[PDB]
Amino acid sequence: EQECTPGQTKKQDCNTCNCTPTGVWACTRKGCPPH
Protein backbone atom coordinates (compact mmCIF):
# COMPACT_ATOMS: atom_id res chain seq x y z
CA GLU A 1 0.00 0.00 0.00
CA GLN A 2 2.55 2.63 -1.07
CA GLU A 3 0.33 4.49 -3.56
CA CYS A 4 -0.65 2.05 -6.33
CA THR A 5 -0.32 -1.59 -7.53
CA PRO A 6 -2.63 -2.68 -10.40
CA GLY A 7 -2.00 -0.46 -13.47
CA GLN A 8 -3.89 2.85 -13.23
CA THR A 9 -2.81 5.46 -15.80
CA LYS A 10 -1.22 8.76 -14.68
CA LYS A 11 -2.33 11.66 -16.91
CA GLN A 12 0.76 13.90 -17.25
CA ASP A 13 0.41 15.24 -20.80
CA CYS A 14 3.06 14.09 -23.34
CA ASN A 15 3.70 10.94 -21.31
CA THR A 16 2.22 8.53 -18.75
CA CYS A 17 3.57 7.06 -15.49
CA ASN A 18 1.34 3.95 -15.57
CA CYS A 19 0.96 1.95 -12.33
CA THR A 20 2.59 -1.42 -11.55
CA PRO A 21 2.61 -4.28 -9.04
CA THR A 22 4.55 -2.03 -6.63
CA GLY A 23 2.96 1.45 -6.67
CA VAL A 24 6.04 3.08 -8.29
CA TRP A 25 5.03 4.12 -11.82
CA ALA A 26 7.09 4.69 -14.99
CA CYS A 27 6.99 8.16 -16.54
CA THR A 28 8.48 8.65 -20.02
CA ARG A 29 9.56 12.03 -21.48
CA LYS A 30 9.96 12.55 -25.25
CA GLY A 31 7.24 14.73 -26.83
CA CYS A 32 3.49 15.48 -26.75
CA PRO A 33 1.06 14.06 -29.31
CA PRO A 34 -1.43 16.11 -31.32
CA HIS A 35 -4.36 17.30 -29.16
DSSP letters of the chain?
--S--S----B-SS-B---BTTB------S-----
| Number of domains forming the structure of the chain | 1
Give a yes or no: residue 35 inside a domain.
no
- List Cβ neighbours of 6 (8 Å cut-off, separation of 6 or more): 19, 21
Give a yes or no: residue 34 inside a domain.
no
What is the experimental method? Answer: NMR
Give a yes or no: residue 13 inside a domain.
yes
| Burial tier of 20 (Cβ tally within 10 Å: 0-12, 13-18, 19+) | middle
Give a yes or no: residue 16 inside a domain.
yes
Domain span at 11: 1-29
Give a yes or no: residue 25 inside a domain.
yes
13, HSE (Cβ side, Cα atoms, 13 Å): 1
Give a yes or no: residue 18 inside a domain.
yes
